[PDB]
Amino acid sequence: SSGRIIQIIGAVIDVEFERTSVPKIYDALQVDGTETTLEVQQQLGDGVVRTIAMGSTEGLKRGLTVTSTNAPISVPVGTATLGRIMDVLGRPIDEAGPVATEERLPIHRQAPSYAEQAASTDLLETGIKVIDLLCPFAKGGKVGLFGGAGVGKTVNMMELINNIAKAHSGLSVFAGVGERTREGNDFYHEMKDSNVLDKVAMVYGQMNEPPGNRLRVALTGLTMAEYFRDEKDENGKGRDVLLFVDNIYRYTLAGTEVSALLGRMPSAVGYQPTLAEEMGVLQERITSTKSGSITSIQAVYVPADDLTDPSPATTFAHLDATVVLSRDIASSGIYPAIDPLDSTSRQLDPLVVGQEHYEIARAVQNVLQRYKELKDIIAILGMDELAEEDKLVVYRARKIQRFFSQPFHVAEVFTGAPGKLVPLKETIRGFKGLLAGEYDHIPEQAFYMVGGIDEVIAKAEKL
Amino acid sequence: SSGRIIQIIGAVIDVEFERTSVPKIYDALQVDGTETTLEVQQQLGDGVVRTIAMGSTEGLKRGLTVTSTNAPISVPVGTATLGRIMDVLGRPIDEAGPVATEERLPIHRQAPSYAEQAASTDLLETGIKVIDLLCPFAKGGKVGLFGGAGVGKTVNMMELINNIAKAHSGLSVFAGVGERTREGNDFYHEMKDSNVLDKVAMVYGQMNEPPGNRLRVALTGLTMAEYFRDEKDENGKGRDVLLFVDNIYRYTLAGTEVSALLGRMPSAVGYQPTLAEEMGVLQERITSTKSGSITSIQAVYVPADDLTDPSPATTFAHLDATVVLSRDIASSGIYPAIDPLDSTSRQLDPLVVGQEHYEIARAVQNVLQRYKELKDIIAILGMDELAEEDKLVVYRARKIQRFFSQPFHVAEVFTGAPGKLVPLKETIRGFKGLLAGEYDHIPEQAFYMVGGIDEVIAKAEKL
Amino acid sequence: AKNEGTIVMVSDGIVRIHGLADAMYGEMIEFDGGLFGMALNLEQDSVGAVVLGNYLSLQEGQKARCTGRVLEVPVGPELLGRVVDALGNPIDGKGPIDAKLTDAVEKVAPGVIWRQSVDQPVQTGYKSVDTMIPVGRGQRELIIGDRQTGKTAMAIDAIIAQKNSGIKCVYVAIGQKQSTIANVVRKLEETGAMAYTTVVAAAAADPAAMQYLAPYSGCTMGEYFRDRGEDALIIYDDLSKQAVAYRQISLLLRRPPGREAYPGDVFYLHSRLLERASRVSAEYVEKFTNGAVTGKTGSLTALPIIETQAGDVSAFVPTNVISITDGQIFLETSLFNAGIRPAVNAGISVSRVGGSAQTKIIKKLSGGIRTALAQYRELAAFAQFASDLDEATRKQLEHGQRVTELMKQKQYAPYSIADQAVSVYASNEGYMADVEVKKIVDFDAALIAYFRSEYAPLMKQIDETGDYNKDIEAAIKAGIESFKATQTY
Amino acid sequence: LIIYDDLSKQAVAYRQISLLLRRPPGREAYPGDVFYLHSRLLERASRVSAEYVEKFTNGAVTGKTGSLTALPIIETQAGDVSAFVPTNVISITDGQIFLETSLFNAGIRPAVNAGISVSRVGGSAQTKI
Amino acid sequence: LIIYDDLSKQAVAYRQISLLLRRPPGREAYPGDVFYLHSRLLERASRVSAEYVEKFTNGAVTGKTGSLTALPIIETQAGDVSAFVPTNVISITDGQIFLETSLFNAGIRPAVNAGISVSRVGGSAQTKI
Amino acid sequence: QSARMVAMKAATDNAGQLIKDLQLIYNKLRQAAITQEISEIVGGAAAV
Ligand SMILES: Nc1ncnc2c1ncn2[C@@H]1O[C@H](COP(=O)(O)OP(=O)(O)OP(=O)(O)O)[C@@H](O)[C@H]1O
Ligand SMILES: Nc1ncnc2c1ncn2[C@@H]1O[C@H](COP(=O)(O)OP(=O)(O)O)[C@@H](O)[C@H]1O
Ligand SMILES: [Mg+2]
Ligand SMILES: [Mg+2]
């Protein structure tokens, strides 16, 4: 009820209460006469609760008053949020008026039980033609996106955001953990440009914010995606939802910064005492229930190019697939620039996909590896020296790379490209035909910027 | 005289007392309620004594009562213990009835004075090629084996027991500290079937017991050997004694486990502040004074597989002969894995062993060091560039490294090959011939796991 | 008053209580709301406790009561084919499990004089681990390797192939995603193995207390059959995650840090657990059961799994574990990515039991294969820098290559004792010398086929008896000849 | 346009003034919040929009888009980039210019390393020519 | 001429006797006053002048000078001459004689490293020939 | 001349392998050093 502030040391604030009732862990508190909310992080006795504030603390003092909500940080969720931008507490920041949904749900909740899990592992079809053949995603699975700016990272995000709603009738949630303000504004305007903003939701927490704000932002996007998945249409089929996170590395870093402020015996290379617990509580709620499913695309950054660091080691135990973007492909003019030799997927086994799909993927990877080993010798020595068989490998690899590039549904403003959503069967058929050797007379130029093997047959017949 | 338990944490119990009767250091106390013997480790004013509990601590509450024996942990000595198995406190555990002797000795006493030390000069020949050639031993000395988990320390300790104690007239004491139980039972039965049990006393404290029992179990075997040394035949001469300690590292590891609870500050890599003094107060009592001669053999464990750790660094100076086991040679399949370099003995000088012995050992170590130094340029560049003499050094070093291998008597089960024994002069002759250059044409594949130069000729012909 | 106490501090799952004067070590405590806690530290004026549940519902001033009984788990033969939480509460929704008796969780192993030497073998279906690294009832072995390298596959293959052999099984999962546990349960139920198996689960979302405690409950449930003359086999899915949970719950207690910020007593935590897998003598069984069963010896096998970073076995926890178990199986990611499956390293993998724990024919046949493999590996690594090699080196390299190709297998494809016997006999005698390397695996398959259709009576005799006599050797040699003489691969 | 002489020296004084006040130690004794300290300063350099200017000045000035640039400076010990403060500041900013010591003494002045010096904005911040 | 068998053992004993006394630790857990411990001991080795000798003995001894040379000993861990204690001792002593394991094992005995061993006093100490 | 090309290319590949191994060792040592320094700092700060 009527509390007091006892100790302001930076963000950490100790708040005293009545003896009988001391707000439980994670119960949000409101400070009278000011915009600031407090989130309990540990109880110390004598009613003292040691908590962290959200937002800056200049102007506060010892002796104020605080009231208790007796509930965690409830965010407003519903269908209204789509197309808006909200704070960590779900407050609008794009100067577009209040949201029109009254449904408040907490962000602190238990994960689904063992009997609530699905009875199967199913695939998610996005028709990118390179993300389905070599690196298949799985409903409920998790993908780690490797690459920085300059290789069109946002273009792929736009394409997936559009495709999830166009083919599987689903909505998406975007949460940005410690992103730069300038590039955030650039992203927002870029998405408003392609007319894709009205299928997504956005939650932003920037670098200038106290680490408490950055740490508990991802849970807001998680709760919104949960509500998008849960609601059932007639026939109760549920929905398939996507969740994007800008860099989980900054999530862990905010976690360890918050641990020190509260004070703790460091562990390992300075990381927090409890490092995996946090990763699990974030990444065990991205699962596939019998009602619906949530997939997650998270971008990752490895410190010091050392995969043995505790943070990459802990986060790598949950990643089901990895996508890598190489600047060399971008320079070669092939979009999207996704490497066909350094991307991994745990779903590429004969048990899940089947026999012929697995054989196709492995055969194309083998041919590409052989071409990668052959290009060095063809450079130092001359092309003619090489055997006729390896030349064939070179030509097939070139055609394969060209075929791996397709137009997008969000680039029709820039070039008038209608956009393609290729079903997987056409991709497998075309690749099997190409590996067989029936597409040996068609010139290579017939493969670039084409959605399907027919388009290639039509394009190749045209010229 | 009756005290009440005040605090129980882990294996450390601190107990109050009356003002005028506080028990002294290292005395033993008995809990009236259950079977437990506590040992005093420190005094804390106000008549409060900190103690380590010998046994289980489950089921012990606060307010339990304790009586004081006013005397340290006494163990029975004499000839009654020949061919029996005993606990840490002397209680028999072989289910063969009580031990009939009133002769009790305390296990905490001062080290022998400087005036009564003795010089050890008589040599002792094991039968193992590398030990009897590069690291020679001498009666009444001290021997140590240093290795990391999985390298071969025990299989060598048992082989030395086979080649020495079985054929020696005199008593023996075997103390096991911080090791597997299965090995203890195997050793007991193996000694029983050979009808040599009646000459050996045994003490066992294994890894399954609380650190209190693992911390003070070497001193009991020490006291038994101490009595067996000073005892003299009536109108008759004394006899030799032998001592075997299975792992002395656990003795310090127990103190490390219980150090912080005693109130001591941490130091170096988490070790207790008082380490070397703790090692010395035990390693000095293993002595061969003017009365009798004790020949002890110990196995020392190397944490994390580096010799720079403080625990295997403090103990290097307490031994006469040191034998260092290498994991790389083990992974190479060379057995026993004894490093020719970094293995020394204080009995290798021209006076004690002769001239030819010294010259042979020195030439061998020189050749091996030369090859180890040469390895790097081979690693980067290749083989053809080196001088022909360096190629000869490479081949000789390989052959020498193989020739140090030898099958054992107690390791027939692992490999299915019978044991072997080699006289010292044969070792000398073989190494002299090898360094001479007369065995150059013999393929290096014939030098593996065969004992004596002749068996090698036969194996080379066999190929 | 002496049994009723209050809560004073709640922080990250550790609760410090007051009162509770007649409180003992290890004894459970019941919080309000049907939530249990375990005492860890006693002090002069307070009691420390870890909550085994969801501590977010507990707040200051709530009450707590001391049951008076040590932490224990329900145990019996009714727990077969069920899935339960660390304390034994079912979660699969198949209804309550009847349990006749409850056993304690904190116990010490039988002494030295109460044990026996392991001589009864255990079969897994993998050629390499049987011939190269034999195992036996009562012997502890460790499966160690890099991430996503095949460790859980080998541990499930043993549980599957133990059907038909009167061996119960317990499977403990610590720090696993719920998807993987559900998938494993599905796979177990498909092949009928769950008919004789038990599963204990503690996921990555579960607190540190349950993840730390679960393997003890698994061991206690597996001790029931060993203490009565029957056998059992328990598999800890990840000990490293248990160590990590212990590290977290100790650093939350401000205990001094150490190598890799691990406390001092991280060797006791693993030794007190891994040294309960023992073979007891008939005297122990007779005394424990009060003469109900006589002339029968118990046993309990353990197969814990541990994971290494960047493929090093020189770390702190891996070497702590290696020195406790009677062996280790090292799975190398470099070979796993290269196609050698299961990827096993002959140099590092060993077993301390040796030839005692296997059949007579396998013992006579699989002699010194591991050392030859390790020497071959070293020699081959040396031949890159060497320009000229003699004939003996060439022969050794070829033999090593053939043996390496032979020891390959797929998932869910068990091999009988006779199969391994025939394959190893063919390998040793050099009948594979003229065979092309690339066909070797396929060749192997054909052999077994030609020994199932004909020579079938021998096959049954070897499978049941496991006996070697000049007749068995002659028959196997004659069979091998016929196959190569008249057949195709 | 603002030019901070050396922030590396701001950090050192922040570490000292924090340790003197008994705040929790961490990597290099640095306090709990250092990344926040540098971000709170380097996130104030932006280019507001005309609506912001009009709202701030109550319509006194319109049509003009305001802007504050920033060029902070950091020095390294023995030419490393993996320390705590250098990594923080590298992560915060929008590009870096590397000045070497090998190039500086070899007579090459100014010593700019074009290999590993980048700017994210790039071509949008240059005149047409 | 005084010889100390191993001041390293002495430094460790000082660390134990100080840590037991509840004194603040530091690099490698060695408390303060570690430099003082070896400096005040190694500074007493010096040569006095004949006037000092004459004054001390009140004229009993005339026309003679006293001296006290020192040769202390310190051990290293795999060549880590940059640890806490060897650097202090190396900074105090006039000269340093280095013994190498890779030289001892090669048969070069005594194993003296000529390229790292120096003496400040130099030729003045030696005889004419 | 035809031998020198392959000789130097093999040398370059071996150098790449060696630098990879050295990088592994370097990372391990760096993490150990950071852990040791942090432990020492925390222990000292507890003393005062
Ligand atoms: N004979 C085989 N052929 C092909 N692949 C195999 C074979 N045996 C095992 N595998 C692969 O090895 C994997 C075994 O899982 P693995 O133990 O590597 O997972 P982990 O993450 O390393 O550990 P955990 O299973 O405990 O999570 C399976 O995914 C399977 O595809
Ligand atoms: N001389 C040897 N010959 C063959 N095998 C050996 C030899 N020495 C040790 N081994 C094997 O190495 C393994 C580890 O050795 P052991 O001494 O039993 O354990 P540790 O090295 O932990 O003391 C054992 O399982 C044993 O079979
Ligand atoms: Mg060992
Ligand atoms: Mg895994």
mmCIF file with all atom_site columns, C-alpha atoms and ligand atoms in Angstrom, chain B residues 147-154 179-180 247 250 301, chain C residues 323 352, ligand 3:
data_model
loop_
_atom_site.group_PDB
_atom_site.id
_atom_site.type_symbol
_atom_site.label_atom_id
_atom_site.label_alt_id
_atom_site.label_comp_id
_atom_site.label_asym_id
_atom_site.label_entity_id
_atom_site.label_seq_id
_atom_site.pdbx_PDB_ins_code
_atom_site.Cartn_x
_atom_site.Cartn_y
_atom_site.Cartn_z
_atom_site.occupancy
_atom_site.B_iso_or_equiv
_atom_site.pdbx_formal_charge
_atom_site.auth_seq_id
_atom_site.auth_comp_id
_atom_site.auth_asym_id
_atom_site.auth_atom_id
_atom_site.pdbx_PDB_model_num
ATOM   1  C  CA . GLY B 1 147 ? 49.691 -37.894 -14.117 1.00 0.00 ? 147 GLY B CA 1
ATOM   2  C  CA . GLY B 1 148 ? 46.183 -36.692 -15.045 1.00 0.00 ? 148 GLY B CA 1
ATOM   3  C  CA . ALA B 1 149 ? 42.967 -38.734 -15.150 1.00 0.00 ? 149 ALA B CA 1
ATOM   4  C  CA . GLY B 1 150 ? 43.095 -41.811 -17.424 1.00 0.00 ? 150 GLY B CA 1
ATOM   5  C  CA . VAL B 1 151 ? 46.872 -41.994 -18.052 1.00 0.00 ? 151 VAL B CA 1
ATOM   6  C  CA . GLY B 1 152 ? 48.121 -45.170 -16.249 1.00 0.00 ? 152 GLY B CA 1
ATOM   7  C  CA . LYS B 1 153 ? 49.124 -44.268 -12.663 1.00 0.00 ? 153 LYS B CA 1
ATOM   8  C  CA . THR B 1 154 ? 47.414 -47.205 -10.860 1.00 0.00 ? 154 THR B CA 1
ATOM   9  C  CA . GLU B 1 179 ? 40.000 -43.605 -4.866  1.00 0.00 ? 179 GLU B CA 1
ATOM   10 C  CA . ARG B 1 180 ? 37.515 -46.148 -6.382  1.00 0.00 ? 180 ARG B CA 1
ATOM   11 C  CA . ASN B 1 247 ? 46.230 -40.841 -3.991  1.00 0.00 ? 247 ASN B CA 1
ATOM   12 C  CA . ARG B 1 250 ? 42.616 -36.015 -2.157  1.00 0.00 ? 250 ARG B CA 1
ATOM   13 C  CA . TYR B 1 301 ? 47.075 -36.416 -9.310  1.00 0.00 ? 301 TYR B CA 1
ATOM   14 C  CA . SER C 2 323 ? 38.723 -40.056 -13.102 1.00 0.00 ? 323 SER C CA 1
ATOM   15 C  CA . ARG C 2 352 ? 38.909 -50.263 -16.986 1.00 0.00 ? 352 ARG C CA 1
HETATM 16 MG MG . MG  G 3 .   ? 43.476 -41.440 -12.272 1.00 0.00 ? 3   MG  G MG 1
#
